[PDB]
Amino acid sequence: VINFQGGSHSYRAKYVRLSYDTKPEIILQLLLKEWQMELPKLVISVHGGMQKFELHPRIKQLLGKGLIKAAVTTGAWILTGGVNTGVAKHV
Amino acid sequence: QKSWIESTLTKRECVYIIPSSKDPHRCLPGCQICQQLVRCFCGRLVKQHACFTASLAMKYSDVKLGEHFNQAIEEWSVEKHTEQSPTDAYGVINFQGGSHSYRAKYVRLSYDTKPEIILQLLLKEWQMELPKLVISVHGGMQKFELHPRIKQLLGKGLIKAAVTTGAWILTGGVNTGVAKHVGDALKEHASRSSRKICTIGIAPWGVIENRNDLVGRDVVAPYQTLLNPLSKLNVLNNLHSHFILVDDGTVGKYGAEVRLRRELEKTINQQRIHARIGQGVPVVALIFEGGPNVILTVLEYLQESPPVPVVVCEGTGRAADLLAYIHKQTEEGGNLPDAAEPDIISTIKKTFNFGQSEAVHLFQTMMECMKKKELITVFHIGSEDHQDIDVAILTALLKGTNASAFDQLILTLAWDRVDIAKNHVFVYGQQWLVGSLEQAMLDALVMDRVSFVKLLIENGVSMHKFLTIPRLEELYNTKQGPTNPMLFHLIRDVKQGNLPPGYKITLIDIGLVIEYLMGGTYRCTYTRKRFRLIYNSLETKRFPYPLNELLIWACLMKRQVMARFLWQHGEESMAKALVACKIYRSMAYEAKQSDLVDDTSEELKQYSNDFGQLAVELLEQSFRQDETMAMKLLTYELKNWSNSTCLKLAVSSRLRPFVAHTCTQMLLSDMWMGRLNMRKNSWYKVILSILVPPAILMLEYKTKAEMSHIPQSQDAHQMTMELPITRKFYAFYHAPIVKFWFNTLAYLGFLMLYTFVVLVKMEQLPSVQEWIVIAYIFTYAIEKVREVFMSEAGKISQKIKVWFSDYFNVSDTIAIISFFVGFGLRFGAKWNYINAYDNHVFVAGRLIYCLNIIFWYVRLLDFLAVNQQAGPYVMMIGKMVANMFYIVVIMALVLLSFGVPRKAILYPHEEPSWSLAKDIVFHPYWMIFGEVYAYEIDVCANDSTLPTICGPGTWLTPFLQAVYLFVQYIIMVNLLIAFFNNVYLQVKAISNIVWKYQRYHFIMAYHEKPVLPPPLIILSHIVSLFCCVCKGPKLFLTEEDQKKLHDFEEQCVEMYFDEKDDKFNSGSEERIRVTFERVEQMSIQIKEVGDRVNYIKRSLQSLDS
Amino acid sequence: IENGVSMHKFLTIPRLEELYNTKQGPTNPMLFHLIRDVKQGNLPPGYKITLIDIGLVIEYLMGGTYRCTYTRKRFRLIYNSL
Amino acid sequence: WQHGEESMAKALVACKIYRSMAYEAKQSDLVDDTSEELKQYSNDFGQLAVELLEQSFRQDETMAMKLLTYELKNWSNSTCLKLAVSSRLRP
């Protein structure tokens, strides 16, 4: 479990470090039973470019409210890239 | 001289007199009109001098016989020919305005004054604080009035950047143009920045009206605001708070203070902005609607060590607007497009007719300026261009020095301007050094800058890597912020009293204070062996939980806002809130128990009662989420807080709202049960099973999983691993509910016997009852001794002072001591054998028994106070006896006001006797309870039972008693009814809480007690001494249940802060006020879109062309 | 005042006498019943109120040992001089 | 009253002037009693003094007590407390 140094939030996670050869069954199992996650009603896989400096103020507000609203209401897994640059940075 | 000024500062008097133009104005006789006219090259005429070198010289001619050889006319320089002399004008002017007598501090100095001297006057004499900024405004004079919006913005922004950065707005002083607009700006935003902005106008002693009035050493000198109907002269302006009235010559000559202003624009630059900050005090220049010589002055700034930058205010005027367009239309740092001189010089021409001779000479003063665009700033009014000049001014000193962001940040830190750091210093692309934000954090923590500690964490500063031993030592050893001066009085009281002069505080000395303020068995991380070793030797010097070491720091240094910040950060929130409540509560007690000018205890107890409420509000949050885990949150060992417990910390601070909270009261209810389910059992069956032992094996116990939230003993937890028969008895007899009813039946059986012994004849030797009775009280006393030893804090005196504070435990000692006096006299006494009670040792022994028993009935109220309904009435009785005291003292005085006249009138022939102290108090007291003594009233009546008391004056007594009872019964008894009715609800509310609070000490005392009541307890005592020379409750979690609990703690703190804002934001007071503020902003915009469309409908007939 | 009128230069004796001796605004009709009760009861028809007569009223309404600026010796002299 | 100095002093004088003006209005024959008007006027300045005392006391306690006992020197060498006791201004 990593831990982030931010204002009053020790934000946690669950890193795994697996080989890319892992059977795809094994992955979903880890996600569901070990990490004790509920199967989502939706998966929003975000694909974009990296180091994309900052979006315009309004367009960041809208993609910041809408992705959250369709993920909080449909219990969704937003699959991402992770790197703090571009997509994962804006997510 | 009684003024630092007079010894130091001076004036200038034009000792030497010279001709004017040499033309006597008209009017043929020339010798005397030469006296009438001739303005000295000083500028005042010969007679206006009055100088002593020139006072007894006009008789002959004056100074300088004859023509004086035209060469030597060109020789008056004030230096040789004008004398420095003691000041004559320093004081406090006063302005005549609406309800504001606006004051100032004029000085009147010579322009030769050393620049050191000036800054000294400003700081020590005028008692001004060194500024964090200097906004030197340079503009043109008599600039009529700015447009309404542009005056609003330069009137809010200059005030906002001066009230927030504690700045000195250096000005000109003359009420025309710059100082005129500065002053009006002050008046439009005064009384919020009144005693925060210090505006020093540096004016000459030349162009100055009521000049002769300002003269007067050390005066409250008057001054006007009626602008002299004819004059080109200038009046000082209303709102300038200080004045530097330079003098070289006379009227006119408005160019001798310019150099002195420059000095003060320099001497402030060499001072350090703060004791911790190495940067010098900044200096900025603000140009609005300037002049011809402004652009000259602008040039000087951007060519000095260092370049004082410039913030120009376009859209106001001529020079600004000129300077606006030119540097705007410039190359990135240089020349222009295909020669722009045609428009520029034409543009320069219309403002100021120069005309290619020197309209080019401007282009040079106008080139090096725009070539230094990086140091020049411009506020484009009407284009939201950095959100009034406060951003722009302050920004100007951060962008224009090619400076490190370390220095740019620290300046914001001395300014307390987080927005300018978060929007212009922590902007994308910024690249910081290894530990530069750390040094900013260390400065923010010491300077008590919570809003930067937030920011520096939010960006990237980890308090785990940051916080070390030698650093966290510094943070205690600072004087550069809000300090607790009592932390030295505490560190003194623990280190034997001796504090050497240096005495750099050590963390070990802080650990000793935290042990003393937290009391009991508390052992801090700093006093341990594992820390005293690493410490004296000097990751290991980094603390594992840094935000728990700083929460204590912020509290010991009395920094609540930092404490109420660092508390949200980290884990163990409810624990830290109850520690802090305890630290401030003990800090408060030791403040009241000490001599000091500022009591600082109503401040600390409020600080304590602020964290105490945070703990209760998190308990109510955890309880509303899950009840079983919330009770676990009260009893888990903390392991960073001396193996203590959140409940134990609340009981340590008498934080009754937490112990009286339904969660604790429900855990307390479950520890009372033990392994027994008293939801599917009844008290009949518990009593029955005490008297019928095999009925223990027919009642319902509780599973191990209904006992997980309950703190247990080890042996009790070792019998949750298996229920067998012998286990089922160990579960019954060790329950606190059973130990209670097993003691009540022995105690009720005890009184039944001791009532019997006291009502029945007491023979020579004690009866079997009285032996059973002595045995109880003897062993009952052994138990109380054992309660005191096995209690708490190892200091024998503390255990003593705690146990003697409860009401009934004082009664128990009198009751126990009195009984064995009476037994000693009863049993130790020679029986007479004729008739008992001829031996007075024996009588005295019995009468102590007959009185000692009153202690033992009243002790039943301690057993009856176990009920939820009864117990608050029992505590209530005593709170009312204390509150009715003074009514009853009045009732005792009305009593003696009656009994003494009565006994005196009815018994006149009495010698002194102790019966006179009974008879003045006896009958008048029994009158309060309805005994009127009807046939003793009017002792001369025929129905009288005191017919021999009839005599002179006895007819007075029935009148006296009529008044007496009216006062006692009709006024005083009913006043006491009225007392009780109107105090009932609030004593009943207190007594319910004190009842719920003392239910901890009671229930937790019945975990430690032996199993056998005080007759048979001696077995349990002996067995506990055998296993003492031959061999409390804790909450056991497995490591996964500790995980699930720390999650539950975190999750409930989040819901607390989330739901607190969701309620604040969703309130009508908050929805009216943000609606209020939006309708303002809209209305502004609607009368601007309404303006633009008015600039569109004009563009229907123009496009029509 | 906000513009420039200084009440120090404005307010003088013969002027501040006028301000008591006006009927061109809201008046206290009892100020004559008070100035009567201190000046023995006799008010001639004109009777232009004097500040010394006002000082006597302020002493009577404030009670005790109160001595106003108008009843002092230093004012009864400058006053009757002007 | 807002103009000038010695505010709390002048508020307690005025309370005393109106209170005595009110008593001499009730102790006299007249069509308009003009005493409920004057006593209200008195009790209006009396409240100004209390509200300035509460303002001085919340700022500094030691100097606020000094504000009760300094000789006034424009008010017959009197004292702001003595003027309040003179008007039975109990608050």
Ligand SMILES: CCCCCCCC/C=C/CCCCCCCC(=O)O[C@@H](COC(=O)CCCCCCCCCCCCCCC)COP(=O)([O-])OCC[N+](C)(C)C
């Ligand atoms: C929280 C817990 C707190 C605990 C608090 C406990 C505090 C306990 C406090 C105790 C105080 C005790 C005071 C007793 C007073 C005795 C005086 C007396 O009776 O004198 C008489 C008997 O004189 C004798 O010598 C009698 C000897 C035989 C009887 C034994 C006495 C037992 C004492 C009990 C031991 C108690 C055991 C205590 C166990 C705890 C003298 O009178 P006389 O004989 O008629 O005349 C003699 C005159 N002549 C000589 C001229 C003939």
Ligand SMILES: CCCCCCCC/C=C/CCCCCCCC(=O)O[C@@H](COC(=O)CCCCCCCCCCCCCCC)COP(=O)([O-])OCC[N+](C)(C)C
């Ligand atoms: C266990 C025995 C219980 C028996 C009752 C014994 C009394 C129980 C009393 C409880 C609380 C009240 C205060 C304690 C009393 C002690 C003296 C005292 O305080 O004097 C006070 C002055 O009082 C005087 O100067 C007058 C005393 C005259 C005595 C007359 C006695 C006869 C009548 C009456 C006798 C009949 C009994 C009346 C019962 C209703 C000073 O008090 P204070 O400084 O203003 O402090 C008040 C509280 N405070 C600290 C929060 C501010």
Ligand SMILES: CCCCCCCC/C=C/CCCCCCCC(=O)O[C@@H](COC(=O)CCCCCCCCCCCCCCC)COP(=O)([O-])OCC[N+](C)(C)C
């Ligand atoms: C917090 C509570 C604490 C208490 C506070 C109040 C203090 C209370 C203090 C009261 C003073 C009493 C002093 C007694 C005087 C000496 C008595 C004596 O010598 O013998 C008498 C004692 O025997 C008795 O029977 C009388 C005992 C007094 C009973 C008191 C009841 C009234 C309570 C009053 C309450 C209101 C108090 C009002 C305020 C002052 C017997 O009779 P005698 O004739 O006197 O002497 C023998 C002669 N003979 C055999 C011929 C008969």
Ligand SMILES: CCCCCCCC/C=C/CCCCCCCC(=O)O[C@@H](COC(=O)CCCCCCCCCCCCCCC)COP(=O)([O-])OCC[N+](C)(C)C
């Ligand atoms: C509502 C009903 C009332 C009607 C209204 C009219 C009033 C009627 C009254 C009238 C007064 C006149 C009566 C005196 C009779 C003759 C003398 C005589 O016998 O004296 C007797 C007593 O009495 C006295 O010694 C004097 C009593 C005076 C007080 C009476 C009350 C005053 C009014 C109200 C005061 C309230 C407060 C005032 C403020 C409001 C003597 O007799 P003895 O006492 O039995 O003793 C004799 C034996 N020995 C010789 C051994 C001692």
Ligand SMILES: CCCCCCCC/C=C\CCCCCCCC(=O)O[C@@H](COC(=O)CCCCCCCCCCCCCCC)COP(=O)([O-])OCC[N+](C)(C)C
């Ligand atoms: C330390 C903890 C103690 C706990 C209790 C354990 C110990 C208790 C056990 C035993 C102790 C008793 C020993 C008795 C010895 C004989 C006495 C004797 O000679 O005669 C007496 C008999 O006895 C009684 O009448 C009882 C006396 C005590 C009163 C009530 C006890 C109830 C409490 C305890 C038990 C219930 C508990 C209730 C709980 C809710 C009286 O005889 P009589 O017939 O009246 O005399 C005729 C009168 N005549 C001469 C005028 C004609």
Ligand SMILES: CCCCCCCC/C=C\CCCCCCCC(=O)O[C@@H](COC(=O)CCCCCCCCCCCCCCC)COP(=O)([O-])OCC[N+](C)(C)C
């Ligand atoms: C200054 C005096 C000494 C100090 C006392 C200080 C108090 C110390 C405390 C306690 C005293 C110890 C217990 C009682 C002692 C009895 C003694 C006695 O004479 O008994 C007599 C009867 O009476 C009994 O036998 C009573 C037995 C019941 C006692 C109650 C406890 C039992 C519970 C168990 C649990 C633990 C119980 C114990 C917990 C402590 C028998 O004696 P005797 O000689 O045959 O006859 C009497 C005399 N005669 C010959 C003249 C007729």
Ligand SMILES: CCCCCCCC/C=C\CCCCCCCC(=O)O[C@@H](COC(=O)CCCCCCCCCCCCCCC)COP(=O)([O-])OCC[N+](C)(C)C
């Ligand atoms: C640590 C706590 C304090 C303890 C204090 C100390 C306690 C112990 C105190 C005193 C010790 C006992 C003294 C012995 C008696 C001497 C006289 C004598 O022998 O007999 C005489 C007794 O004459 C009397 O007057 C007896 C009165 C005794 C009661 C007084 C004590 C009250 C204690 C207060 C309560 C405290 C309760 C506790 C409060 C917390 C007469 O009897 P005789 O001789 O057999 O025959 C007749 C002869 N003659 C007629 C010629 C005279």
Ligand SMILES: CCCCCCCC/C=C\CCCCCCCC(=O)O[C@@H](COC(=O)CCCCCCCCCCCCCCC)COP(=O)([O-])OCC[N+](C)(C)C
């Ligand atoms: C051999 C012997 C055979 C058996 C003997 C039998 C002996 C019988 C013994 C006792 C009688 C009482 C029985 C009722 C109990 C009810 C249940 C209970 O616990 O209630 C409460 C009583 O809690 C106490 O602690 C009560 C103590 C009683 C002693 C005081 C006597 C008063 C004497 C003065 C009067 C003078 C007259 C006295 C007579 C002259 C506590 O409950 P609670 O805290 O509310 O918890 C429940 C909360 N809930 C409802 C939310 C779930």
Ligand SMILES: CCCCCCCC/C=C\CCCCCCCC(=O)O[C@@H](COC(=O)CCCCCCCCCCCCCCC)COP(=O)([O-])OCC[N+](C)(C)C
């Ligand atoms: C013989 C048999 C008689 C009947 C038996 C009766 C047995 C008794 C029955 C019931 C007792 C009630 C239980 C008390 C509960 C605890 C209260 C406590 O701790 O203290 C309370 C006070 O102190 C008291 O209240 C003292 C005890 C009061 C007893 C009343 C005696 C009055 C008689 C005397 C007059 C007699 C006149 C005649 C004189 C001769 C708590 O007070 P507080 O407010 O929390 O804090 C105090 C501080 N403060 C002052 C700042 C507020």
Ligand SMILES: CCCCCCCC/C=C\CCCCCCCC(=O)O[C@@H](COC(=O)CCCCCCCCCCCCCCC)COP(=O)([O-])OCC[N+](C)(C)C
């Ligand atoms: C309430 C307003 C005022 C109204 C009051 C009305 C005034 C009342 C009217 C009249 C005055 C009182 C006397 C009248 C009765 C005389 C008859 C007489 O002889 O009586 C007795 C004596 O009594 C005296 O000698 C008493 C003398 C004056 C007492 C003091 C004034 C009482 C008034 C207090 C006012 C309190 C005011 C409180 C103020 C709030 C009986 O004497 P004797 O036994 O017959 O003589 C023989 C004796 N020998 C045998 C031993 C020799």
Ligand SMILES: C[C@@H]1CC[C@@]2(OC1)O[C@H]1C[C@H]3[C@@H]4CC=C5C[C@@H](OCCC(CO)CO)CC[C@]5(C)[C@H]4CC[C@]3(C)[C@H]1[C@@H]2C
């Ligand atoms: C403020 C309150 C005013 C009222 C009051 O409290 C204080 O003032 C107290 C003074 C007390 C008297 C002092 C002196 C004695 C002498 C004594 O003489 C022994 C006689 C003999 C035996 O026969 C020796 O052998 C008898 C008692 C007596 C008269 C006192 C009585 C009570 C009095 C009046 C008290 C009363 C309650």
Ligand SMILES: CC(C)CCC[C@@H](C)[C@H]1CC[C@H]2[C@@H]3CC=C4C[C@@H](O)CC[C@]4(C)[C@H]3CC[C@]12C
């Ligand atoms: C003047 C002396 C010598 C005579 C006796 C005084 C009376 C008033 C004494 C004798 C014994 C006393 C009682 C003894 C025990 C208790 C229990 C305690 O928790 C409250 C007070 C109380 C209830 C006492 C009240 C006063 C009392 C009744």
